[PDB]
Design a binder for this molecule. Structure first.
Ligand SMILES: [Ca+2]
Length: 273
């Protein structure tokens, strides 16, 4: 087979020494890499920029003529990644080299056989501030028809977090938008946790961290991201090879999804970033 799917809740990706490089989610589709040796115990695979090995125990072969395989497609305006059969995200502008309605395949969403994408928000240094003001960030709720968000009118708090912790406020808004459905998830409402931060704070079990109010949620999550990611050399969203996505999420397209939201917000607010 050319394509395999991850069977368990998560599975590790290893290097040739057997060292753990990253982990990926159930249902993720990996490509067999024909330039490296596979055996019955481990397959040489690629996923989200990462070339490594996975245990055959963790994988199921797919048939591309009947099983969903992620792909990219242009509508003539934007280029979309189908991350699931019924879910696409805009990743780039249409290029003249793209045939509209043709499915394209890529292990990193950057290199295609007939064209090359810039995904600049995916690799942007997150310690550089946004050019959007608090009031501009606050406008995006109406421009994207975001209703009943706890993050409505919190632009000033995002900008405070950016001033204090030196973490891009557009990124913070986009990350919170993706992880908590714009501060509308049950975890957002119960625990003021907009960024999917888990800890062992209140229960003997792994649970969403609790923050006291919306502002302390935004500032506390930013502090946590600074201390656990930025300060430890994960300074861009990235993918399974580099950046925050290596550790932050099993979803191999977590970084791409947040970059997509940054792209959409940036377009609606006039392209300052
Ligand atoms: Ca190694």
């Amino acid at each position: 087979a050319a394509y395999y799917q991850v069977v368990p809740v998560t599975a590790n990706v290893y290097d040739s020494d057997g060292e753990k490089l990253s982990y990926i989610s159930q249902g993720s589709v990996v490509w067999l890499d024909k330039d490296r040796k596979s055996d019955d115990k481990r397959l040489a695979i690629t996923i989200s920029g990462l070339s490594g090995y996975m245990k055959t125990e963790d994988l199921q072969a797919l048939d591309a003529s009947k099983d969903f395989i992620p792909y990219y497609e242009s509508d003539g305006h934007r280029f979309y990644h189908y991350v699931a059969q019924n879910a696409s995200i805009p990743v780039a502008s249409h290029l003249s080299d793209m045939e509209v309605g043709k499915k394209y395949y890529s292990a990193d969403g950057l290199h295609f056989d007939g064209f090359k994408l810039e995904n600049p928000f995916l690799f942007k240094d997150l310690t550089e501030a946004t050019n959007y003001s608090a009031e501009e960030l606050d406008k995006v709720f109406s421009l994207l028809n975001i209703n009943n968000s706890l993050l409505e009118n919190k632009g000033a708090t995002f900008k405070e977090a950016e001033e204090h912790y030196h973490i891009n406020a557009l990124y913070l808004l986009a990350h919170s938008a993706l992880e908590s459905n714009w501060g509308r998830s049950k975890i957002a409402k119960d625990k003021n946790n907009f960024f999917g931060i888990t800890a062992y704070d209140t229960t003997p079990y792994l649970s969403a961290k609790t923050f006291d109010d919306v502002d302390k949620g935004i500032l506390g999550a930013t502090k946590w991201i600074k201390e656990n990611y930025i300060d430890r050399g994960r300074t861009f969203l990235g993918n399974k090879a580099s950046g925050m996505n290596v550790e932050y999420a099993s979803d191999p397209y977590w970084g791409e999804k947040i970059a997509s939201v940054m792209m959409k917000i940036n377009e609606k607010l006039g392209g300052k970033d």
